[PDB]
């Protein structure tokens, strides 16, 4: 209709002819209409999507928090198609990443009375009321795009360690997805930083699946382990005590949460202990001795992936600490490891390859 068309001519005022407050005020009034009127939204998307978008994103500045919030709502309310290049008007490195990693959000808006009422009213309706959370959301929802973002991996790790949010799944996923498979020396130093940050978190964070996947992914680059070597025995203790805490779930388990957790902690152990023989000999990891004894005595015909993984990580620990297993114990281990190798060979060359290496010492 007209009505929408004339409304939009009005609200989309030339940004080069207005003050930032007036711009901000028109954007507020636009968001609030769109929030209140699905029909206006359909209209924009069918007929004026490019002009509304170029108007909203003509200027972006992560220091203007209220405008940035409104702009995150627009991106979320009338997103462009995935491959539309006008997504580049929201710079990952200079707008989105800064907003994603800055928890400070103003609690007041400078403005008339009606401006402030309109703002409160919008805030009560928005999916998120600050740009840290909205910008993480936009980034992971619409822009998991994207070439790796420079400075993203350590800045996200720093954001997790400050601990302001109650859920890290999105931060962690974006951190994980911005680790490349063939990092430059510069990426590697960023990866080192981020790993030292995450490895410095409370022991509780070592039970968070998101954080563990980042830690596994970062530790895939062995040069990250060398640059951070003095932190490894400490991480290994934490992980080995956690595994020991839930050892009842290693042989058998009816818990998906506990099983995935043990698999991810053992996968992280494996990453560290197969590459750092000094860390493989950390004393608490050798208390995996107890559990292996349990398993060896009361053999089981059935071996789950978690138990196989435990035994592999154990074989690394035993070898580094100079544990000598009597011939029965060594042959059971060698033998269960060879069977695990036959399973994993078609689907995880990394594990197979670690098993092979270890079997050379058996």
């Amino acid at each position: 209709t007209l009505k929408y068309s004339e409304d939009l001519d009005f609200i989309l005022s030339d940004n080069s002819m207005t003050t930032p407050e007036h711009r901000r005020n028109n954007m507020l009034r636009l968001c609030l209409d769109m929030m209140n009127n699905e029909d206006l939204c359909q209209y924009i998307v069918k007929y004026r999507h490019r002009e509304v978008w170029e108007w909203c994103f003509q200027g972006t500045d992560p220091k203007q928090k209220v405008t940035s919030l409104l702009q995150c709502f627009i991106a979320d309310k009338i997103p462009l198609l995935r491959h539309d290049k006008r997504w580049a008007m929201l710079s990952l490195e200079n707008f989105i990443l800064p907003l994603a990693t800055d928890e400070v959000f103003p609690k007041k808006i400078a403005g008339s009375r009606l401006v402030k009422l309109n703002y409160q009213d919008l805030l009560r309706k928005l999916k998120f009321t600050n740009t840290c959370e909205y910008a993480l959301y936009i980034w992971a929802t619409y822009l998991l795009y994207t070439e790796a973002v420079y400075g993203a991996v350590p800045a996200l790790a720093r954001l997790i360690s400050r601990g302001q949010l109650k859920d890290w799944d999105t931060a962690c996923s974006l951190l994980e997805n911005n680790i490349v498979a063939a990092p430059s020396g510069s990426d590697i130093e960023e990866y080192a930083q981020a790993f030292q940050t995450l490895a410095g978190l409370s022991r509780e964070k070592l039970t968070n699946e998101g954080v563990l996947k980042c830690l596994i992914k970062l530790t895939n680059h062995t040069t990250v382990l060398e640059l951070s070597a003095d932190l490894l025995p400490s991480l290994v203790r934490s992980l080995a005590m956690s595994v020991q805490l839930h050892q009842n779930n290693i042989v058998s388990s009816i818990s998906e949460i506990k099983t995935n957790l043990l698999i991810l902690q053992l996968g992280l152990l494996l990453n560290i202990v197969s590459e750092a023989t000094t860390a493989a000999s950390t004393e608490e990891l050798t208390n995996f001795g107890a559990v292996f004894r349990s398993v060896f005595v009361k053999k089981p015909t059935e071996m789950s992936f978690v138990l196989q993984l435990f035994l592999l990580v154990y074989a690394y620990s035993a070898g580094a600490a100079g544990v000598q297993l009597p011939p029965a114990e060594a042959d059971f281990l060698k033998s269960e490891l060879e069977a695990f190798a036959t399973d994993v060979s078609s689907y995880n060359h990394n594990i197979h390859t670690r098993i092979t290496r270890v079997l050379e010492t058996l």
């Binding site: 498979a181 996947k213 596994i216 992914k217 895939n220 099983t259 995935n260 698999i263 991810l264 996968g267 494996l270 990453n271 992936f305 993984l309 689907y347 995880n348 060359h349 990394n350 594990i351």
Partner: peptide, 11 residues
Amino acid sequence: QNRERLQLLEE
């Protein structure tokens, strides 16, 4: 299927 099998180790 969606079971954790550590394919993450290979990226």
